[PDB]
């Protein structure tokens, strides 16, 4: 699926500027599309899958090698059994057709990750999912994250629960909990935060998708229904990103510099309190504030790196299987 002349030309032009490394999609509007085409709702969703495959080829042709998609919300479990089963069966088809199509997965280096509270899915679907993930690890040429039975609050709650597990197990002190640590406990911990969040149809809301990860992302709300997505919709979204990029990255960097500044102030106030209780002075040629500060940080890093190594060990315990 190569690009046409105009698509290729326009791609070359915008590639002279900053390009997103990671794009996230809320693929919304499948049912309204089915009503507009006078088709059953199941074919609205099947058309939705075909558009996902097409759009992924567009990203690849643009050098965007990591994509995250909202495929099923925990909230979507509230739909009718007829519709829920239809979606589960679609997932059963594609994840099984992802098998057989292996080696074509290895040849192109496609890593597949499926994120969410997967214990809510049918037991058989969890096995297919685990197979696809187990096979496509170690692949590193492109990355597709499928958010399946996912909400962002459920992901954030789980990250905190894992940090509380580290404390309960003794690998973590409550003082070690930080924004960065929570980042490394999310389901998305192996990918950078998305440069763009795209939601289709007319909705201007996030519907519990990547709330932590997209706090500084460029947000693009496009009226088109998802099964009607075109290359030029995608192109428009990237155009938005490029126009926002300088102010957005300065704000992203100011946020980071402000967080590190405040952390340094908090740590040095900690060193001050421990020094004040002790007869020891606030400052001195012995520079004991400076060595207490380095030990405070180093012992924190060793505890965190030990907790993360243990968290990844129990994450990679499937086996589930």
């Amino acid at each position: 699926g190569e690009l046409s002349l105009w698509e290729r030309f326009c791609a070359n032009i915008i590639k002279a500027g900053p390009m997103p490394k990671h794009i996230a999609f809320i693929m919304d509007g499948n049912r309204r599309y089915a009503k507009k085409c006078q088709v059953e709702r199941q074919e609205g969703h099947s058309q939705g899958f075909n558009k996902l495959a097409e759009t992924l080829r567009w990203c690849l042709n643009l050098g965007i090698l990591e994509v995250t998609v909202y495929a099923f919300s925990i909230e979507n479990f509230k739909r009718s059994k007829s519709e829920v089963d239809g979606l589960m069966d679609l997932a059963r088809q594609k994840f099984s057709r992802l098998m057989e199509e292996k080696e074509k997965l290895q040849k192109h280096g496609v890593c597949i990750r499926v994120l969410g509270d997967l214990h809510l899915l049918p037991l058989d679907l969890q096995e297919l999912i685990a197979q696809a993930v187990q096979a496509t690890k170690n692949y590193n040429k492109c990355f597709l994250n499928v958010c399946f039975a996912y909400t962002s609050r459920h992901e954030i709650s789980n990250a905190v629960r894992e940090m509380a597990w580290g404390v309960e197990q003794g690998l973590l002190d409550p003082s070690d909990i930080s924004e960065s640590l929570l980042d490394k406990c999310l389901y998305t911990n192996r990918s950078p935060h998305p440069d763009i969040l795209i939601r289709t149809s007319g909705e201007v809301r996030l519907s519990d998708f990547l709330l932590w990860q997209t706090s500084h992302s460029c947000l693009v709300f496009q009226p088109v229904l998802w099964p009607e997505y075109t290359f030029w919709n995608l192109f428009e979204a990237i155009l938005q990103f490029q126009m926002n990029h300088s102010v957005l990255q300065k704000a992203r960097d100011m946020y980071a510099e402000e967080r590190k500044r405040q952390q340094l102030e908090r740590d040095q106030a900690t060193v001050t309190e421990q020094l004040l209780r002790e007869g020891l002075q606030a400052s001195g040629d012995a520079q004991l504030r400076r060595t207490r500060l380095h030990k405070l940080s180093a012992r924190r890093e060793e505890r965190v790196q030990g907790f993360l190594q243990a968290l990844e060990l129990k994450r990679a315990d499937w086996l589930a299987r």
């Binding site: 919300s73 925990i74 909230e75 979507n76 479990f77 509230k78 739909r79 909400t151 962002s152 609050r153 459920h154 954030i156 709650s157 905190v160 629960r161 894992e162 940090m163 509380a164 597990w165 404390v167 309960e168 973590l172 409550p174 003082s175 909990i177 930080s178 924004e179 929570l182 909705e203 201007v204 809301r205 996030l206 519907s207 519990d208 709330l211 932590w212 997209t214 706090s215 500084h216 992302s217 460029c218 947000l219 693009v220 709300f221 938005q240 926002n244 102010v247 957005l248 704000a251 100011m254 946020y255 402000e258 967080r259 405040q262």
Partner: protein, 200 residues
């Protein structure tokens, strides 16, 4: 005054739905924000019947100039709309001035507080679900924002309460700098017309 107050109340009641909590997000950093325009937005929200207003900028300018902002709100809550301490208390209850630390840093703070309870053998990791964490977020007893008005050229929420905006409608206006009541109310009827299906 009784006429202007009655008119703004009928305006709010005429809409299909009103936000209980509105967020004002200012992204423009090419100039110091206009306190008089922000205060007019806040006073309109209160006069049309919106219970809570959060004012936010990612640089913390409003947070470092809290008194000037409140004083401007109070001044314009007179003149428009016609017990000073009662008026002061009622604005402190309705108006929160936020900065980035009220989002991710506050979630981290709640995680620290919860994890120290686990350390004291008073809670278990499994005791923390979605609703429990929301209970100790530092924004307890207050509803989540239904509507955010984002002003300026940045197409990002820039750190505004990421946990709380899961279902928030985000309406973008190009600038707050000479905002008119008609422009503000246009955004209100946009929110009134939006359809939230909650996953169904």
């Amino acid at each position: 005054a009784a006429h202007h107050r009655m008119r703004w109340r009928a305006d709010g009641r005429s809409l299909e739905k009103l936000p209980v909590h509105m967020g004002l997000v200012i992204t423009e950093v090419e100039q110091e924000p206009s306190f008089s325009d922000i205060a007019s937005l806040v006073v309109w929200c209160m006069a049309v019947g919106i219970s809570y207003i959060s004012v936010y900028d990612h640089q913390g300018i409003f947070k470092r100039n809290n008194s000037r902002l409140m004083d401007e709100i109070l001044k314009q809550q007179q003149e428009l709309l016609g017990d000073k301490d009662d008026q002061v208390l009622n604005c402190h209850l309705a108006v929160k001035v936020l900065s980035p630390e009220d989002g991710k840093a506050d979630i981290v703070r709640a995680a620290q507080d919860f994890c120290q309870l686990v350390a004291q053998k008073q809670k278990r990791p499994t005791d923390l679900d979605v609703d429990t964490l929301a209970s100790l977020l530092s924004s307890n007893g207050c509803p989540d924002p239904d509507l955010v008005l984002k002003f300026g050229p940045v197409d990002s929420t820039l750190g505004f309460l990421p946990w709380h905006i899961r279902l928030t409608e985000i309406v973008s206006l190009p600038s707050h700098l000479n905002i008119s009541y008609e422009d503000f109310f246009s955004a209100l009827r946009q929110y009134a017309a939006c359809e939230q299906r909650l996953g169904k």
